[PDB]
């Protein structure tokens, strides 16, 4: 069940999944529609679901990782697609081998240096590239 802010923007949560507290390498996942493209893992909040809980759930489902939830980075809008995403830091401590989206749609995941994550996100997901700006 999709959820929405009062202005009709779809509510989402996502994590920047870092390998370590150094925050030098981040986990991206393949686009569901275009698997040769990379995205930051995330998705819709469920009814009455805390944003931090949604963020952790979505990265388990999409990226097959768990870890230590860190700070809220910020709340980011995509004007064209009308969605608003809470973006958290997650320090990955567990990497699972056969996660929901790997099994269901063959979703891929890969570690990127921050500068390379920004590069591959820029063309189709410039708002996601902007998560890393600070
Ligand atoms: O841009 P929207 O209209 O909100 O639609 C998006 C988009 O799907 P499209 O392929 O239809 O543009 C995402 O696909 P990608 O970012 O992977 O290319 C998809 O993401 P995922 O399948 O990766 O989860 C996302 O879902 P979400 O916001 O839950 O991450 C889905 O929105 P819906 O699930 O609400 O249709
Ligand atoms: Cl790191
Ligand atoms: Cl976006
Ligand atoms: Mg998603």
Swiss-Prot record:
Q: Catalytic activity, per the record?
A: diphospho-myo-inositol polyphosphate + H2O = myo-inositol polyphosphate + phosphate; 5-diphospho-1D-myo-inositol 1,2,3,4,6-pentakisphosphate + H2O = 1D-myo-inositol hexakisphosphate + phosphate + H(+); 3,5-bis(diphospho)-1D-myo-inositol 1,2,4,6-tetrakisphosphate + H2O = 3-diphospho-1D-myo-inositol 1,2,4,5,6-pentakisphosphate + phosphate + 2 H(+); [phosphate](n+1) + n H2O = (n+1) phosphate + n H(+)
Report the outcome of residue 83 to L: Induces a strong decrease in Ap6A and [PP]-InsP4 hydrolysis, while it only weakly affects PP-InsP5 hydrolysis
Q: What is the effect of changing residue 62 to Q?
A: Loss of diphosphoinositol polyphosphate phosphohydrolase activity
- What does the record give as the active site? 61 (proton acceptor)
Segments carrying motif Nudix box:
43-64
Coiled-coil regions in this chain? none
UniProt-reported outcome of changing residue 76 to Y: Induces a strong decrease in Ap6A and [PP]-InsP4 hydrolysis, while it only weakly affects PP-InsP5 hydrolysis
Q: In which tissues is it expressed?
A: Widely expressed. Expressed at higher level in brain, heart, pancreas and liver. Also expressed in placenta, lung and kidney.
Record flagged with keyword Nuclease = no
Q: Which residues take part in binding Mg(2+) 2? A: 58
| Compartment(s) where it occurs, according to its Swiss-Prot or TrEMBL record | Cytoplasm; Nucleus
Name this polypeptide is given: Diphosphoinositol polyphosphate phosphohydrolase 1
- Protein species of origin: Homo sapiens (Human)
- What does the record give as the organism's lineage? Eukaryota, Metazoa, Chordata, Craniata, Vertebrata
């Amino acid at each position: 069940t999709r959820t929405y802010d009062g202005d009709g923007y779809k509510k989402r949560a996502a994590c920047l999944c870092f390998r370590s507290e150094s925050e030098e390498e981040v986990l991206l996942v393949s686009s569901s529609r275009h698997p040769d493209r990379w995205i930051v893992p995330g998705g819709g909040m469920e009814p009455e679901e805390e944003p931090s809980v949604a963020a952790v759930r979505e990265v388990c489902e999409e990226a097959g990782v768990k870890g230590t939830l860190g700070r809220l980075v910020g709340i980011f809008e995509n004007q064209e697609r009308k969605h608003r995403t809470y973006v958290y830091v997650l320090i990955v401590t567990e990497v699972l081998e056969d996660w929901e989206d790997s099994v269901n749609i063959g979703r891929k995941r890969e570690w990127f240096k921050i500068e390379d994550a920004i590069k591959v996100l820029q063309y189709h997901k410039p708002v996601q590239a902007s998560y890393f700006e600070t």
